[PDB]
Amino acid sequence: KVPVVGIVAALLPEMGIGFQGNLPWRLAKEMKYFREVTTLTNDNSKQNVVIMGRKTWESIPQKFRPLPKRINVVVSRSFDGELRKVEDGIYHSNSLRNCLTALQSSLANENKIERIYIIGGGEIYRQSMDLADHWLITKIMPLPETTIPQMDTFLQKQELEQRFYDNSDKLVDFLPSSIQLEGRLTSQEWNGELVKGLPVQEKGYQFYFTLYTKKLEHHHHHHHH
Ligand SMILES: NC(=O)C1=CN([C@@H]2O[C@H](COP(=O)(O)OP(=O)(O)OC[C@H]3O[C@@H](n4cnc5c(N)ncnc54)[C@H](OP(=O)(O)O)[C@@H]3O)[C@@H](O)[C@H]2O)C=CC1
Ligand SMILES: COc1cc(-c2ccccc2)ccc1[C@@H](C)C#Cc1c(C)nc(N)nc1N
Ligand SMILES: [Cl-]
Ligand SMILES: [Cl-]
Ligand SMILES: [Cl-]
């Protein structure tokens, strides 16, 4: 019942997302978007979940984790069970898939989770293409005189474009109501590809907030008893 949304910032055209265990850039306006989207809810009695891999957890500055006002879930194969409270605001899971099933139980969550955000990293995102209902992707482009940063971790763009379509026309309506964005919806060609979303510029980069949604599926089978 709860939507599952991957959220990621990726550098075009390869969709690079990391280098040596960290982000390849430091963009406050992008972090602000990430913070506001994952924190805010339409219903004030609910919170969102943020699920992340162990390495991504380790990348967040210690003074800023667990991420405030969101239920944090860290997944590691060395953890105990599918969903265990380990500290205030922190759950541990040994399974991305089982943790999502556990988080979907209305008995366990009392319908007080609005959305489940998958917040990284590379290995987690690879496993999330068949799990997410949507992707919020910030598409980042170095401006003309900007050096392309070195990167060693990438979003699976092939799998994304196979399963999802660019639904950025509906981004504004998809985001929590109280969020405010500066830019207006724009379509721009960049190194061949069509980039559509809400634009921002910061330091040496231009970036677009985009929304990807699952493509329509044929009706092949519905389980009957
Ligand atoms: N640009 C962006 O938007 C974002 C980028 N990133 C970047 O990604 C990089 C980190 O990504 P990556 O190295 O792939 O690491 P991840 O953050 O994906 O963590 C991988 C770890 O998660 C655990 N894990 C993976 N799959 C499962 C599963 N199915 N069940 C249980 N545990 C699982 C394992 O932990 P263990 O080894 O303990 O078993 C594994 O080593 C960094 O550079 C980071 O900055 C991260 C978030 C956002
Ligand atoms: C080092 O990486 C972080 C630092 C911080 C953080 C928070 C407060 C102060 C400094 C860093 C928050 C989240 C992250 C990670 C988990 C992220 C992210 C993320 C970002 C930043 N943007 C988008 N669009 N999607 C995402 N998943
Ligand atoms: Cl945050
Ligand atoms: Cl799993
Ligand atoms: Cl697995």
Identity of residue 102: A
- The experimental technique used to determine this model is X-ray
Identity of residue 159: E
Q: Which domain holds residue 189?
A: 1-225
54 is known to lie in a ligand binding site? yes
- Expressed in angstroms and rounded, the spacing between residue 146 Cα and the centre of ligand 5 is 38
Main-chain phi, psi angles of 48, to 5 degrees: -95, 160
Q: Judge if the beta carbon of residue 34 lies within 6 A of ligand 2.
A: yes
Query: Is 12 among the catalytic positions?
Result: no
**What total number of domains does the chain contain?**
1
Tell me, what CATH number does 9's domain have? 3.40.430.10
| Candidate list 11, 12, 30, 83, residue with the active-site label | 30
Within 8 A by CB and 6+ apart from 44, the residues are: none
Q: What is the resolution of this structure in A?
A: 2.0
Pairwise CA distance, residues 96 & 106, whole Å: 18
Looking at 10-81, list the stretches that DSSP marks H as alpha helix, in order from N- to C-terminal side: 28-39, 54-59
Query: Is 143 among the catalytic positions?
Result: no
Tell me if residue 168 falls in helix, strand or coil: helix
